[PDB]
Amino acid sequence: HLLSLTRRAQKHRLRDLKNQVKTFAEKEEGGDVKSVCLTLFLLALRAGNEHKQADELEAMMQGRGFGLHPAVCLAIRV
DNA sequence: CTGCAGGGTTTTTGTTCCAGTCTGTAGCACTGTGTAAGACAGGCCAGATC
Numbered sequence: 001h002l003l004s005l006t007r008r009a010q011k012h013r014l015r016d017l018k019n020q021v022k023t024f025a026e027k028e029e030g031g032d033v034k035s036v037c038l039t040l041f042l043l044a045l046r047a048g049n050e051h052k053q054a055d056e057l058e059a060m061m062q063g064r065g066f067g068l069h070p071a072v073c074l075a076i077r078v
Numbered sequence: 079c080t081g082c083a084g085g086g087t088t089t090t091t092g093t094t095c096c097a098g099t100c101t102g103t104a105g106c107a108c109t110g111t112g113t114a115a116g117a118c119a120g121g122c123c124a125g126a127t128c
């Protein structure tokens with residue numbers, strides 16, 4: 001399983017999906033790498049759905065921190 | 079059937095370099111913990127004594 005090999009190892013696998021995402025970025029967004037993968041993965045995880053990850057996947061990017069936000073780290077240091 | 083050599087096969091695993099972008103340690107000049115009375119030699123004076 002690819003989860004056991006190195007990250008360098010994976011070179012051969014995802015060529016076609018990189019081509020597809022580069023072609024898709026042009027016609028609808030213009031270069032938005034984040035969203036096209038985020039809304040795909042967060043929703044595909046909920047295909048066979050346990051909410052244990054739905055919490056982990058929701059706060060991952062925007063709110064808040066992930067990990068603790070930099071301002072919270074600054075306050076807990078000062 | 080087996081044995082081993084050596085053919086191809088995919089898939090690591092890493093192969094060269096230049097824009098970068100990010101991370102982690104090096105260089106700078108300097109800190110703070112070292113924290114008290116006692117020994118000794120000389121000058122002298124005051125009270126005792128003949």
